[PDB]
Amino acid sequence: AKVQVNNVVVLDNPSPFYNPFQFEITFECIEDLSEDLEWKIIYVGSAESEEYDQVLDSVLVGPVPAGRHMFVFQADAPNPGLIPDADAVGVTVVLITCTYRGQEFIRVGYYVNNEYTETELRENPPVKPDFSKLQRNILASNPRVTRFHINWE
Amino acid sequence: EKXXXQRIA
């Protein structure tokens, strides 16, 4: 792989549900790449259906200069109006992917736990989720890193 | 319908 992801640090975690995601990413480009590199953050609104995935943000750079690069990838929180009530509270997934010439070469997945923090709400959760009272906890210590063979030339 | 908790992979 001509692009290697050296580190991903999850920032501002845990945080309120409405806070933007912040991932500090360090990567190495072994050689100059003439085409475009695109990073994306995708929120899994529903483990029951991929139709509820929300692309929170995307960053594009091209050509890609060789060397060591670092940036904080920030994305606004998902739209709660598109999250099924059954999936709002509890564990879900957030993904960071990178593509080169449209080919996905790396996917970094985290479990995300959205939970109430006050006793009354944890003991009597409202039938309609209250996103203003949810805390997002990204399970940052163990991301699932998947790499894919792509054509770099 | 929760048995895709392998979306992280």
Domain boundaries, chain A: 1-153
Contact A129, A80 (CB under 8 A): yes
Query: Using CA atoms, how far apart are residues A110 and B4, in angstroms rounded to an integer?
Result: 15
CA–CA separation, A65 and A110 (whole Å): 28
Q: Could you count the other beta carbons within 10 Å of the beta carbon of residue A51?
A: 9
Q: Please answer yes or no on whether A93 and B4 come within 8 Å at the CB atom.
A: no
Residue pair A75/A15 in contact by the 8 Å Cβ criterion: no
Residue numbers of B between 1 and 9 with CB closer than 8 Å to A: 1-2, 4-5, 7-9
User: Residue A21, Cβ neighbours under 10 Å: how many?
Assistant: 25
